Amino acid sequence: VMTELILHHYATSPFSEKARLILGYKDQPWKSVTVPVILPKPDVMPLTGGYRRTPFLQIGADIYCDTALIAQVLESIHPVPTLYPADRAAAAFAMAQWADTTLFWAAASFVGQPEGFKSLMAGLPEDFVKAFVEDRKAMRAGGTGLRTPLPEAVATLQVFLAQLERQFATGEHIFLFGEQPTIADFSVYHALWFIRRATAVAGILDAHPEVVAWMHRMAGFGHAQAQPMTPAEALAIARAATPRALTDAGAGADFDARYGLPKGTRVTVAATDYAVDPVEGDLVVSTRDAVGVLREDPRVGQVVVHFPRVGYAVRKVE
Amino acid sequence: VMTELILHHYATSPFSEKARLILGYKDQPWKSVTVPVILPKPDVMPLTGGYRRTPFLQIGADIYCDTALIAQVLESIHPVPTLYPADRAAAAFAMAQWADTTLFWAAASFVGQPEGFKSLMAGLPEDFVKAFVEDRKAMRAGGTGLRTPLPEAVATLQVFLAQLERQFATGEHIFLFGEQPTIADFSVYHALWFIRRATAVAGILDAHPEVVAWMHRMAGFGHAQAQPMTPAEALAIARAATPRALTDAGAGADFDARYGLPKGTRVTVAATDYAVDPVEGDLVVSTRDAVGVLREDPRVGQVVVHFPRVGYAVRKVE
Numbered sequence: 214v215m216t217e218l219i220l221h222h223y224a225t226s227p228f229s230e231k232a233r234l235i236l237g238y239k240d241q242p243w244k245s246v247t248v249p250v251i252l253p254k255p256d257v258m259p260l261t262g263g264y265r266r267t268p269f270l271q272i273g274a275d276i277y278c279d280t281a282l283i284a285q286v287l288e289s290i291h292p293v294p295t296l297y298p299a300d301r302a303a304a305a306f307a308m309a310q311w312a313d314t315t316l317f318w319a320a321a322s323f324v325g326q327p328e329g330f331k332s333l334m335a336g337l338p339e340d341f342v343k344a345f346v347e348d349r350k351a352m353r354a355g356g357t358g359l360r361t362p363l364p365e366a367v368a369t370l371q372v373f374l375a376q377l378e379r380q381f382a383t384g385e386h387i388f389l390f391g392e393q394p395t396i397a398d399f400s401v402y403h404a405l406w407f408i409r410r411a412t413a414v415a416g417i418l419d420a421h422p423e424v425v426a427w428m429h430r431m432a433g434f435g436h437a438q439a440q441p442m443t444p445a446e447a448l449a450i451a452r453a454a455t456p457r458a459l460t461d462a463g464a465g466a467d468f469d470a471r472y473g474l475p476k477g478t479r480v481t482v483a484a485t486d487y488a489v490d491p492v493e494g495d496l497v498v499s500t501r502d503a504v505g506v507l508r509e510d511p512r513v514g515q516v517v518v519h520f521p522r523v524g525y526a527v528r529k530v531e
Numbered sequence: 532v533m534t535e536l537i538l539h540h541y542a543t544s545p546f547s548e549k550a551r552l553i554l555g556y557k558d559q560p561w562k563s564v565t566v567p568v569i570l571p572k573p574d575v576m577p578l579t580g581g582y583r584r585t586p587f588l589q590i591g592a593d594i595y596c597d598t599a600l601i602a603q604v605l606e607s608i609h610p611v612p613t614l615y616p617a618d619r620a621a622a623a624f625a626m627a628q629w630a631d632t633t634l635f636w637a638a639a640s641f642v643g644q645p646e647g648f649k650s651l652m653a654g655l656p657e658d659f660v661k662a663f664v665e666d667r668k669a670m671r672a673g674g675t676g677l678r679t680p681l682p683e684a685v686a687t688l689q690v691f692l693a694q695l696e697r698q699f700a701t702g703e704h705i706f707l708f709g710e711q712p713t714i715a716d717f718s719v720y721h722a723l724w725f726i727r728r729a730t731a732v733a734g735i736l737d738a739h740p741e742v743v744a745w746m747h748r749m750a751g752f753g754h755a756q757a758q759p760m761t762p763a764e765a766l767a768i769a770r771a772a773t774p775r776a777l778t779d780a781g782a783g784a785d786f787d788a789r790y791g792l793p794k795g796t797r798v799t800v801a802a803t804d805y806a807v808d809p810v811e812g813d814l815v816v817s818t819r820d821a822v823g824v825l826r827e828d829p830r831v832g833q834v835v836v837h838f839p840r841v842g843y844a845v846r847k848v849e
């Protein structure tokens with residue numbers, strides 16, 4: 214079987230929680246593959262070609278990185294109930310972007326303060342904690358994101374939570390845009406879920422009762438039905454599979470060349486905010502919102518690795 | 532008279548256009564004070580204490596910097612029609628933030644390309660153009676914002692414009708959240724207005740007919756009624772006036788000390804994204820969303836300079 218949805222993630226990851234909750238909302242069964250929290254990730258690299266962030270979605274030999282894109286893929290498969298109401302398209306898109314960048318960075322900083330950090334690392338060996346701290350520092354080497362100072366983090370949280378509370382207090386809708394959550398609900402949710410996990414500093418949430426109630430409604434979607442799969446099993450599946458763009462049916466798909474890179478061009482794709490690890494391959498998938506690069510790994514053969522455009526940089530190799 | 536609304540701005544400034552359009556929407560008469568496009572600004576510094584960005588709103592001896600805060604002040608004065616519908620509070624706040632940062636930075640980069648830049652500088656002396664280029668480079672010295680590379684700028688614009696077009700094409704509402712514009716409409720608008728001004732590259736807008744129609748509806752609000760005032764007249768007015776926090780009525784206003792800086796503390800306030808010029812004074816105004824610092828200038832006496840919290844950093848002087 215090479216059409217199962219295989220999510221590569223770990224339990225304590227907020228961005229992984231976002232994807233798992235969306236899976237619940239879509240009532241989409243999936244396979245669960247645990248990845249390491251820190252480098253190195255030798256069972257991950259043959260799939261992603263260097264991208265080390267979590268989570269990513271594997272379907273056969275197609276590897277979809279970033280939750281903004283994973284959500285779009287899941288929407289493609291089960292469009293109902295939708296994450297992207299047409300009548301809220303721009304507002305939901307922009308709010309989700311802000312939530313998954315600026316808001317998340319404030320939550321990370323807020324939780325990174327001494328009491329918060331102590332709460333997060335509570336049941337873990339001191340070896341791992343030190344390595345985690347070093348791993349995340351190296352992760353910030355190339356970018357601009359995920360380095361909001363504590364005082365600005367606190368203000369962004371206080372200001373935003375009050376606006377969130379105000380909106381919900383009107384009692385007009387149970388989610389941000391109506392009686393169904395949108396992508397923006399999920400993006401905001403995991404940032405706040407991360408704070409809730411930082412037990413010693415979670416009190417900031419409790420000062421906002423309506424926000425807490427909304428979180429409870431979001432949590433109710435669950436994570437659908439999952440079964441574990443080993444990292445090795447996932448690699449075998451990618452190896453046996455042919456990427457969609459290389460099948461006779463998928464090869465005729467429209468290729469957006471307006472961006473000035475023709476099909477087949479050797480490129481790299483890299484995140485721009487942090488973890489700026491370049492992934493190299495041939496540009497074989499190009500849409501308005503996303504790209505896909507064909508690469509060849511000795512252990513999985515050919516895979517195509519997909520990224521959204523926003524938050525990433527595509528450059529010609531030369 | 533020391534209760535007129537005095538906007539310090541210049542014609543070609545997108546952020547100034549945002550404030551002027553909001554003034555039209557509120558039907559709020561104002562006084563117009565032209566400031567220089569580039570440094571130095573000796574008629575501005577006695578008011579702002581170092582903040583060199585445009586626009587700012589003066590009311591007597593209170594100086595309100597940043598359009599996010601100017602909008603809140605204008606809302607305080609004419610709350611109807613509102614910019615901040617309670618039932619859309621968080622969505623409008625977040626979307627406006629994203630529009631006034633990420634989206635604006637993509638528009639700036641997009642317009643900064645050779646043909647775009649040529650269009651913008653068309654009727655201007657080559658002296659000024661060179662100085663402008665140097666001025667804006669020095670402006671980016673301390674921050675992270677306003678440096679989106681052209682290819683990423685193009686993708687952010689294409690992706691967002693399609694979502695905007697999709698939302699409007701449903702025909703459900705004439706503005707982003709209903710039959711009245713919100714703060715988010717104004718924030719998105721000026722970024723696109725800036726692109727429209729870059730004649731040679733404005734065609735990107737025309738590929739999105741519904742977005743163009745929405746821009747036309749926004750433009751219709753006009754700029755209310757304005758009269759010119761000289762920079763010197765504005766300085767005299769600040770000089771004669773007493774800041775609200777120093778009046779008997781305003782002195783009892785609630786002071787938010789939860790952020791850990793008591794009233795009277797000597798601080799600096801500085802933008803975090805670009806133009807990171809620190810403004811020093813005593814912290815005498817503190818709310819959840821904003822701060823105000825009392826300073827003394829030999830030429831205007833005491834003024835209080837106000838900033839929003841989000842996008843700024845407040846630090847104790849020592």
Ligand SMILES: N[C@@H](CCC(=O)N[C@@H](CS)C(=O)NCC(=O)O)C(=O)O
Nearest residue numbers: 226227228250265266267279280281
């Ligand atoms: N924009 C990315 C952000 C992903 C992200 O930052 N994930 C965190 C985990 S919560 C991460 O990658 N940490 C480094 C790692 O997993 O090795 C997305 O939406 O998927």
Ligand SMILES: N[C@@H](CCC(=O)N[C@@H](CS)C(=O)NCC(=O)O)C(=O)O
Nearest residue numbers: 544545546568583584585597598599
């Ligand atoms: N966040 C600020 C941004 C203001 C801004 O960047 N203004 C531009 C003018 S369009 C600027 O300050 N350029 C430098 C200058 O005016 O000297 C706001 O919303 O007011």
Ligand SMILES: [Zn+2]
Nearest residue numbers: 225226227228
């Ligand atoms: Zn994480």
Ligand SMILES: [Zn+2]
Nearest residue numbers: 230233234436
């Ligand atoms: Zn969970």
Ligand SMILES: [Zn+2]
Nearest residue numbers: 241242290291
């Ligand atoms: Zn299904």
Ligand SMILES: [Zn+2]
Nearest residue numbers: 441442443446
């Ligand atoms: Zn097994």
Ligand SMILES: [Zn+2]
Nearest residue numbers: 543544545546
């Ligand atoms: Zn400008």
Ligand SMILES: [Zn+2]
Nearest residue numbers: 548551552754
């Ligand atoms: Zn105008």
Ligand SMILES: [Zn+2]
Nearest residue numbers: 559560608609
């Ligand atoms: Zn009035």
Ligand SMILES: [Zn+2]
Nearest residue numbers: 759760761764
């Ligand atoms: Zn006069």
